[PDB]
């Protein structure tokens, strides 16, 4: 796969098979040293972000190269593959191991090998099926929010409803206003006070229930695998449906197939193909992370509990009410009925390889493949909806086309110049090419849900322009890799490659990279064979790699259509341009050490690394005086120094008992070493983060100091300013000048996990933990929930009942009437330990199929994200980087499943 | 193997080598202007004045300007691939207008130099397109000056910024990062661009959709009034004030039908192309208006104080079009100046609340003239035009005496983002906390006290330069102490 001097971790089929989320990468959170997996939303359609050995770029992308059986595959297309077909996944961590890959090898390379046939006289057919549920994993934010009664009295005292008012006068007004509104709809005016009680001050509406539901995940599987006499085959058809637990609909549905075959056709030729495909339905909840009244977890906390979206039966009403509205507001389930959405993606991945071995040591392999996505999506605005602003409907149709091609051709010569000296030479050509496409059209003015073909919309002023986007990129590569074998203990391998990209101009698009690698088998040259030690290898790497993962057309000084009139074309300047734009260049030193003990009953490996980034692709923010937003430049430089270590032992092992465990850790210090124009620092406006030379990407804000117990006013420390011996200065006058670098990183430095396992006679328990330590996050929800000086129509935290007063000064809650600022009091420790997987599994005994059809069976209960440990006051400490914002929290899951074998 | 890929739907920047290419770049600029000198982009400064209070409906969108939340105003807004709004957005779209106007101005100049045009007629039109570009440069740099440089009355500021203008980039230069020009450099650039355009542009306007000499005079009369140069403001006003008749209407709905119509309103000196399908937009910040079948329903986040309602005599046509008694059914007033051009509806049955971008109506030239004429002792001209405008609107003013000019200008320009400027020029502090909210709206429009007072000379009447510009440019000296 790669080299012996390389940093490599392999995860086998166990940790990939049959997890209950489409997002395969999530199963690897806390599984691979130095690989930080994190999913910022529990939407089933979300995809994990992955960083190997810190972040390499402030502009270009940190994402590893994902590769399946030697084909660069996007995660979106990985998601349309059944992971039970995955034999293993290899994470390639340093420059020596990522030598025969390119494009963005500087981010590491995640290699996935699918299952292959096992050449047996009786083929192996195995069936899987699982059913389970997802529900929101943490409800603690609900606990200290105001009740209906507490909120209404808080508002009235605070003056929100007028200065001359009472609690009862306000509830009369809100009641009058609901009755009056609902009485304008023939669909409500006889339900109000019989079936719909939208305003109710004597009961609190459960807004968690109104916006979140338990949702089922089901999946099932049947595999065929075998082979005979050079021919091998693995075939599989499967189903997967995961529903989103938010009432805003979101799902991932996949009907999938794979046929892997290969055959030794004669003495010199082996051929094969790894065919896979899918029909896939993918739906996103597209309001999360924005602040919309009554929407998402934000609305779960901030909806006044005296507004009620259910009917007398406890099912959601179609509509709900807030005072002042002149149109009632639609609930999730009803909005979804009026805004239907479907997306059917057809996904075909066709590939093949020929392997020609014409003489001894000479392996010529040509491989070629295309991954085709055709996606149709339909979207409607249902006509004749009385709670919409038009009776006229609308419809939008979209066709997406993605074609991505690969050809990789290698010659490999394995020869030994004697028997104590071994050489293998390899040279290769790689071409990759992507062409992508979307067209969209929409019509409106429909007056009947039965008459909604796009051709039937109104003409004239109801007409609209179609959507159209096009995109292309291409990667030409030639590469080489040589391996030398002294005796049986000293291994040196070396590589050099050239990469050219679509994304840079003609005179800047080509770059050379290289890597040097050493492995030294200390144990088998200098320890012979011993007692406790079983293995000891020294590993070392220096090498360079490229990152080019930016946009497709970022150097061109461009002009675009921008019409003034309908009768003549308008041109406007579209981009700034940068003709020198070229590769981001990363070098990485790696020093590794692997050991095995007792007799490899205790495995371990620890690695040290320095990863550097020059000519860093920063999408440089520009002054708005420029009239642009940003232009990519090779300007920055950055450093990632860290260690990752990993151990694995068999704890207890009887004839009828077996216990095992494993754990990995990474610490990674980031350091910006150069920015742009000689600037020492750049604070990213309105993010609370800053880039500054010498430090990691760090948070940046004023330091909240409390309140002056005699005014009720908020206090901030004046940074770099001090007093008598009672020292740190404070001010009630907020200003941006008070903001300063905080010593907390925006990327978490610590990334590890650990796995416990025991098997006692066919019964088995397996726990899988992950942790992210050092994560910090602005909790943006609390700018609203703890606001005493604004958004006074929103439900707030109970703490504001104890706000400062001339008659209540022994408090830390600030006097109502002042806005919060985005200071340290919103900066929460988002570190967390999650019990990612817990699987109790009973392998039925061989003694029952004694019967010439069924071979065995397994049953299992399983939970995903059963436990979370964190101090974060929002729903999900992982559902964000930087700022936590109306999150679609990750999900907990409960699953029961059975396996059959024939 | 060719690795070149250029984006479909885009072409390369190239110098102007043809008259058709020049005209296309001219139009693209006027498309930019359409979303720059845009009423949406002036609602923030309209709300920061003394006329509005926030309602229980506001989602803290308008409260920072209405109640002077300086901790929000400081770095308010956004400009990015996803939204261009607020103070940042205002600052960005006028600078982009400048950068892109710079490119049109210099490229037409290079094209006239290189003699790439084919006859004497193309040459003279390009010379006009040139003048047009200059006016837009002037308008861009002045709208920046109007919010981002201090006026003479300011008290405490940050050290040095009291007589700084804006960063004055005169060429097309994306990479430029430089200091603020002084105020004198800015205003002389703005005025010399304008004066050069007045010599070239024809006397009669070719099109309401393109810059004219009438507009340049009108834009320079506005700028002179804002600078307190009354006699010069009055002189420019007199060139244009008689050229556009005031809307003649016998009753308020007659006024409304004419007024709200871009095409038929004879007061419009210069508007941006709008049709239902290009160039029209909703502008519902003030009124909070929403279609409801064949009707319009309202839920505003801000409504005038009571004094603003009593400004209007009950027979003033603007009392029904500029403000409208449509809060809580029919119980209070919101500002309705931007309700709709009905011509931009998709279906005529169905309100869709789209307007177009107007850039100067002749009513503003009446008020510019009346104020300057008052300030220069020319009371007959001030008497004539205040009595003329106020009479045309259905409520001729009784006295003509500055106090009514203030009343009348405020009545005429509500929603257009003038009253903040007028407060500074007339030495009016923000007496928000002492204003009665509309009584029929209680429970809905209630009292919210200023988070910071705004006395005469208070620095925050001028916005701070956006954080993006502050962070990226250590040569940029900031406005706020």
């Amino acid at each position: 796969l790669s080299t012996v001097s390389g940093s490599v971790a392999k995860v086998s089929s166990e940790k990939l098979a049959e997890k209950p989320v489409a997002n395969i990468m999530d199963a690897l959170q806390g599984q691979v040293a130095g690989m930080q997996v994190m999913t910022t939303s529990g939407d089933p359609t979300a995809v994990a972000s992955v960083e190997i050995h810190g972040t390499g770029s402030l502009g270009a992308s940190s994402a590893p190269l994902y590769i399946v059986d030697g084909m660069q595959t996007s995660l979106d297309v990985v998601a349309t593959m059944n992971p039970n077909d995955f034999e293993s996944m290899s994470v390639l961590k340093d420059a020596s191991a990522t030598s025969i890959y390119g494009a963005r090898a500087a981010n590491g390379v995640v290699f996935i090998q699918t299952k292959k046939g096992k050449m047996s006289e009786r083929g192996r057919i195995t069936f899987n099926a699982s059913y389970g549920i997802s529900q929101i994993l943490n409800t603690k934010p609900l606990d200290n929010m105001m009740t209906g009664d507490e909120l209404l009295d808080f508002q009235v005292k605070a003056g929100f409803w007028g200065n001359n008012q009472t609690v009862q006068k306000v509830k009369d007004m809100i009641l009058a206003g609901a009755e009056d509104l609902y009485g304008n709809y023939d669909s409500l005016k006889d339900e109000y006070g019989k079936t719909l009680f939208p305003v109710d001050f004597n009961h609190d509406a459960d807004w968690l229930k109104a916006l979140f539901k338990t949702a089922p995940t089901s999946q099932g599987d049947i595999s065929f695998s075998g082979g005979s006499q050079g021919t091998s085959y693995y075939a599989s058809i499967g189903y997967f449906d995961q529903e989103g637990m938010a009432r805003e609909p979101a799902n991932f549905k996949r009907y999938s197939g794979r046929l892997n075959f290969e055959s030794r056709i004669n003495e010199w030729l082996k051929v094969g193909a790894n065919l896979s495909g899918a029909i896939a339905n993918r739906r996103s909840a597209d309001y999360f992370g924005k602040y919309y009244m009554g929407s998402g977890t934000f609305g779960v906390l901030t909806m006044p509990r005296y507004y009620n979206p259910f009917d007398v039966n406890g099912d959601l009403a179609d509509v709900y009410y807030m005072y002042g509205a002149t149109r009632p507001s639609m609930t999730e389930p009803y909005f979804a009925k009026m805004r239907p959405f479907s997306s059917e993606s057809h996904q075909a991945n066709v590939n093949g390889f020929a392997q020609i071995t014409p003489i001894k040591g000479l392996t010529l392999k040509a491989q070629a493949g295309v991954d085709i996505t055709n996606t149709r999506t339909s979207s409607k605005r249902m006509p004749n909806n009385p709670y919409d602003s038009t009776p006229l409907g609308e419809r939008r149709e979209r066709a997406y086309r993605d074609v991505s091609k690969s050809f990789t051709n290698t010659a490999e010569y394995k020869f030994s110049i004697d028997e104590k000296h071994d050489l293998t030479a390899l040279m290769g050509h790689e071409y990759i090419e992507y062409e992508g496409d979307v067209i969209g059209a929409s019509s409106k003015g429909f007056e009947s849900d039965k008459l909604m073909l796009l051709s039937q919309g109104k003409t004239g002023n109801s007409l609209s322009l179609p959507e159209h986007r096009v995109a292309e990129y291409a990667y030409l590569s030639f590469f080489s890799r040589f391996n030398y074998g002294f005796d049986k203990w000293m291994y040196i391998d070396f590589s050099v490659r050239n990469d050219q990209s679509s994304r840079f101009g003609s005179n800047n698009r080509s770059a050379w990279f290289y890597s040097v690698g050493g492995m030294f088998d200390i144990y088998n040259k200098f320890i012979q064979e011993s007692n406790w030690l079983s293995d000891l290898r020294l590993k070392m790497s220096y090498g360079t790699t490229g990152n080019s993962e930016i946009g497709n057309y970022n150097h061109q000084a461009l002009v675009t259509v921008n019409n003034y009139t309908e009768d003549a074309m308008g041109l406007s300047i579209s981009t700034a341009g940068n003709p020198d734009l070229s590769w981001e260049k990363q070098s990485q030193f790696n020093f590794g050490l692997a050991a095995g003990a007792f007799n490899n009953r205790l495995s371990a490996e620890v690695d040290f690394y320095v990863r550097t980034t020059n000519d860093m692709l920063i999408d440089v923010p520009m002054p708005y005086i420029s009239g642009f937003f940003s232009q990519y430049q090779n300007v920055g430089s950055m450093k990632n120094t860290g260690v990752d270590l990993s151990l694995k032992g068999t704890i207890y092992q009887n004839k009828d008992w077996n216990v095992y465990a494993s754990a990995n850790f990474n610490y990674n210090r980031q350091e910006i070493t150069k920015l742009f124009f000689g600037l020492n620092k750049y604070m990213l406006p309105n993010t609370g983060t800053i880039w500054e030379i010498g430090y990691p990407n760090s948070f940046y804000m004023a330091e909240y100091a409390g309140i002056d117990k005699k005014t009720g006013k908020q206090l901030w420390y004046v940074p770099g300013q001090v007093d008598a011996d009672g020292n740190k200065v404070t001010t009630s006058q907020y200003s941006a000048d008070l903001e300063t670098r905080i010593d907390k990183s925006v990327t978490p430095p610590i990334t590890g996990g650990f796995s416990l396992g025991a098997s006692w006679k066919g019964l088995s328990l397996d726990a899988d933990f992950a942790y992210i330590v050092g994560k910090w996050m602005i909790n943006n929800d609390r700018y609203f929930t703890e606001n005493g000086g604004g958004l006074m129509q929103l439900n707030k935290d109970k703490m504001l009942l104890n706000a400062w007063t001339e008659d209540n000064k022994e408090t830390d809650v600030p006097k109502l009437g002042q806005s919060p600022q985005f200071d340290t009091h919103l900066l929460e420790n988002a570190s967390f330990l999650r019990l990612k997987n817990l699987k109790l599994t009973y392998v039925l005994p061989n003694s029952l199929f004694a019967q010439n059809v069924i071979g065995g069976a397994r049953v299992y209960l399983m939970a995903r994200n059963l436990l979370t440990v964190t101090k974060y006051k929002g729903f999900d400490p992982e559902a964000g980087g930087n700022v936590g914002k109306n999150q679609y929290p990750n999900s907990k899951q409960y699953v029961a499943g059975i396996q059959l074998s024939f | 193997c060719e690795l070149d890929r250029d984006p479909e739907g885009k072409d390369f920047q190239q110098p102007y080598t043809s008259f058709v290419q020049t005209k296309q770049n001219r139009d693209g600029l006027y498309a930019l202007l359409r979303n720059t000198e845009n009423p949406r982009m002036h609602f923030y400064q309209e709300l920061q004045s003394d006329m509005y209070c926030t309602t229980i409906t506001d989602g803290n969108s308008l409260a920072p300007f209405v109640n002077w939340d300086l901790g929000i105003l400081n770095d308010h807004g956004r400009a990015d691939e996803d939204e261009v709004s607020g103070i940042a957005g205002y600052y960005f779209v006028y600078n982009r207008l400048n950068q892109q106007a710079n490119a049109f101005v210099n490229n037409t100049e290079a094209a006239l130099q290189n003699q790439v045009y084919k006859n004497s007629t193309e040459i003279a039109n390009a010379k006009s397109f040139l003048a047009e570009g200059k006016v837009l440069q002037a308008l861009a740099i002045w709208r920046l000056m109007d919010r981002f440089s201090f006026h003479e009355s300011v008290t405490e500021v940050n050290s040095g910024a009291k007589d700084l203008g804006v960063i004055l980039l005169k060429e097309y230069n994306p990479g430029y990062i430089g200091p603020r020009a002084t105020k004198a450099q800015c205003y002389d650039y703005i005025l010399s661009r304008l004066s050069e355009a007045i010599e070239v542009l024809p006397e009669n306007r070719e099109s309401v959709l393109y810059v004219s000499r009438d507009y340049a005079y009108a834009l320079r009369a506005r700028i002179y009034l804002a600078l307190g140069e009354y006699g010069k403001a009055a002189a420019d006003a007199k060139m244009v004030v008689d050229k556009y008749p005031l809307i003649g209407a016998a009753d308020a709905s007659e006024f409304e039908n004419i007024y709200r119509s871009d095409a038929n309103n004879p007061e419009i000196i210069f508007r941006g192309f709008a049709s239902a399908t290009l160039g029209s937009f909703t502008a519902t910040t003030l009124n909070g208006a929403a279609p409801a079948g064949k009707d319009i329903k309202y839920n505003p986040s801000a409504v005038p104080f009571q004094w603003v309602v009593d400004l209007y005599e009950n027979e003033d046509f603007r009392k029904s079009v500029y403000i409208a008694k449509v809060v809580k059914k029919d119980k209070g007033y919101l500002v309705n100046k931007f309700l709709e051009d009905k011509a931009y509806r998709d279906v005529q049955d169905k309100p869709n609340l789209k307007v177009g971008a107007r850039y100067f109506s002749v009513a503003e030239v009446y008020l510019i003239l009346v104020e300057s004429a008052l300030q220069t002792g020319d009371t007959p001209t001030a008497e004539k035009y205040l009595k003329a405008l106020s009479k045309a609107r259905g409520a001729e003013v009784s006295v003509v005496n500055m106090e009514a000019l203030q009343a009348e200008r405020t009545r005429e320009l509500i929603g257009e983002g003038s009253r903040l400027r007028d407060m500074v020029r007339w030495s009016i502090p923000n007496n928000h906390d002492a204003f009665e909210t509309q009584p029929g709206l209680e429970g809905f429009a209630n009292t919210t006290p200023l988070k910071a007072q705004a006395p005469v000379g208070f620095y925050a009447y001028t916005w701070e330069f956006p954080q993006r510009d502050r962070q990226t440019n250590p040569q940029l000296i900031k406005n706020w102490p």
Binding site: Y292, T747, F784, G790, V883, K885 | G59, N60
Partner: peptide
């Protein structure tokens, strides 16, 4: 869109 103020995603975008 009741955003009293949402920080935009800094390093998350």
């Amino acid at each position: 869109q009741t955003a009293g103020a949402n920080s935009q995603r800094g390093s998350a975008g």
